[PDB]
Copies of this chain bind each other. A is one copy, B any other.
Amino acid sequence: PEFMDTCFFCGAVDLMRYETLSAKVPSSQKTVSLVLTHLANCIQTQLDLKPGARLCPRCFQELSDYDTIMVNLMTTQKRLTTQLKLDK
């Protein structure tokens, strides 16, 4: 029977299901492909995303959580800067 899954960001569960790169991270609702091209960019490289690529649930969560931190950083930054601009 067993057809078998492999994380593009680490390794192998004969599969808590594995995600395509078009899967959306929840906080921004942008594709998890876009979060991977963000991290590639943070270290001055290209990535090649085959239409094969899947993600373990662990990695999908890691990437989700990063995007989530990145959102709640950008929003609390605006709350605080717009406060700085204000009077009394």
Q: Chain A: residues with CB nearer than 8 A to chain B?
A: 9-11, 36, 39-40, 42-43, 45, 47, 62-63, 65-66, 69-70, 72-73, 76-77, 79-81, 83-85, 88
Chain A facing B: main interface SS: helix
B80 touches A63 (CB 8 A): yes
Which of B10, B62, B65, B85 is within 8 Å of A43, CB to CB? Answer: B85
How often does this chain occur in the complex, in copies?
2
Top 3 A-B residue pairs of the complex, sorted by shortest distance between their CB atoms: A11-B88, A69-B73, A43-B81
B76 touches A69 (CB 8 A): yes
Given A70-B73, A73-B73; A40-B80 close (CB under 8 Å): no
